[PDB]
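Reminder to self: tokens first, then the designed residues, so the page reads top to bottom the way the pipeline ran.
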């Protein structure tokens, strides 16, 4: 409202939502565990376009690039995967084939390889330690520590005050913990606080899945994960 939900997007298709000038999110849907799950990403204008995360599938990522050209008309040249799970590196092959330079942290590339997922080409330097931040085009890449995964990153747009938290951040509609298989429930709460303390000026917070909001998503996630912990 007007952000597109799980309904409002047929499977295989992708839709864009402009959050600010030169800043969009791309919304896709996927069937897993017997439920249609939505999934968010980010598109940031870089003068060319910088992509954050795939659209959760080769077919969806192809629809993503197709939708970008239809409605933005600028070429995607770089892509970054926030962690190694298939909903973030799934479609990296399609991106690579189209001429996009794909990026990811050394940890993410390794864990993706071990898991047997698509491996981004380039290695992002300087995100090894908890609290590390780097500059990659119009965004700042930040590693808050282990949370949803030991390797998850969050993306911030200092030009639009947009904070893309990936799956490390739950939407408000989510009451319980999602996929915590490779998650660190012990370090998750500390990691969320690093984001809060490093990006207290975020206007719009984009979770990995669902509707966007404000910084209130952080302690909400903290409330969910801590409840799941017990
Ligand atoms: Cl390159
Ligand atoms: Cl390349
Ligand atoms: O994920
Ligand atoms: Zn994941
Ligand atoms: Zn390259
Ligand atoms: Zn996820």
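Designed residues (230 positions):
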């Amino acid at each position: 409202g007007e952000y597109p939900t799980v309904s409002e997007i047929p499977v295989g298709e992708v839709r864009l939502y402009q959050i600010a000038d030169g800043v969009w999110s791309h919304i896709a849907t996927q069937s897993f565990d017997g439920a249609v799950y939505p999934s968010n990403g980010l598109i940031v204008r870089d003068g060319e376009l910088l992509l954050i995360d795939t659209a959760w599938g080769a077919k969806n990522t192809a629809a993503l690039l197709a939708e970008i050209e239809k409605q933005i008309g600028l070429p995607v040249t770089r892509a970054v995967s926030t962690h190694f799970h298939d909903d973030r590196v799934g479609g990296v092959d399609v991106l690579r084939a189209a001429g996009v330079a794909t990026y990811a942290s050394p940890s993410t590339r390794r864990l993706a390889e071990v898991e047997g997922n698509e491996i981004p080409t380039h290695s992002l330097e300087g995100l090894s330690s908890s609290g590390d931040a780097v500059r990659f085009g119009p965004v700042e890449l930040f590693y808050p520590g282990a949370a949803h995964s030991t390797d998850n990153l969050v993306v911030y747009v200092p030009s639009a005050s947009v904070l893309y938290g990936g799956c490390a951040i739950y939407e408000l509609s989510r009451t319980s913990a999602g996929n915590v298989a490779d998650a660190d429930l012990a370090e998750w709460p500390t990691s969320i606080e690093r984001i809060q303390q490093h990006y207290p000026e975020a206007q719009f917070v984009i979770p990995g899945h669902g509707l966007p909001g404000g910084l209130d998503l952080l302690k909400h996630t903290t409330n969910v994960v801590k409840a799941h912990t017990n």
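Helices lie at 58-71, 86-89, 92-98, 106-115, 188-198, 216-229.
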